[PDB]
Amino acid sequence: GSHMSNISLIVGLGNPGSEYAQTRHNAGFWFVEQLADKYGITLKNDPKFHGISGRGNIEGHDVRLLLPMTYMNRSGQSVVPFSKFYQIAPEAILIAHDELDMNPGVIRLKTGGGHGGHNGLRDIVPHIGPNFHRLRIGIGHPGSKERVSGHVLGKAPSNEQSLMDGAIDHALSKVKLLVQGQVPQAMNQINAYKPA
Template structure:
């Protein structure tokens, strides 16, 4: 059975100074996913973000890049989800993940925010409902908590960026599989990528 996902959100920070930073891995995913599906993206001020509606066979699925800055992501996600009556269980949030190395991505549903400010705000704006799906794009950990902010807001070296882009390509295929055939096949595919 196909995954019933009606909203795919990629997290990041707006502005050219953040464009190439690790924290924008969710934006990179949405851009690649939209390109793969020939989905035009346009600014939507009422949702405080850049959105797109996927073509057939998934016309009920929307894409969103919040333009609110990371720690206010929920202020973009919640209005769009509410307007189109999309419950948290039908939302997939794509975000950078410190606990996975570059070149690795994993699906997950529910759970805490792990200190990720974008997830934290989305959970808050969903009335503390954390039951949405996540696609965690590995960016690696700098080794010490004092260095996390500089790491996520830093530009990865080319070797890491290449690894992140490769796993984003694989993740696009995996989400396509989820939409077509369901989470089991999508997870088997993505979680076996080496």
């Protein structure tokens, strides 16, 4: 299974299908797909766990990647059985997700806490508890609760996309620290990111 707070499972949240691939709610998929390409981890079909998943070496550590294919609000139907089957404790999990409460181009590593209204996290925390790590990828808030769907299921304008893409690229460079268990240092260096 997992060992301590070396990160050994990295989950990206999102919705399946070409119609959601470019939407803000898929920010976690963007991060994990880019990370898989960086390290040469194959993301392959994983019907048993209702997802796409992979396994490979990141900087000398055996790491699994998971993209639930459940739709966002059912993400726990993938993450929970997968993590349980591979005996990965929450403390060794990083979940990348869009964060309404942060600007595009802001990115933070957080340990613990609630779902913050995120419908994917809402499906995960009841089962495994809160003590996993999160890569909060800022996407902005549309104002009101009625607008949140249009916002997260929207395709960001180019300036916002650029800001998010730069923040995601920065975080990819800090995954080495995470898989080595250097959560405090990774937190400091991720959270310090500025776009400009």
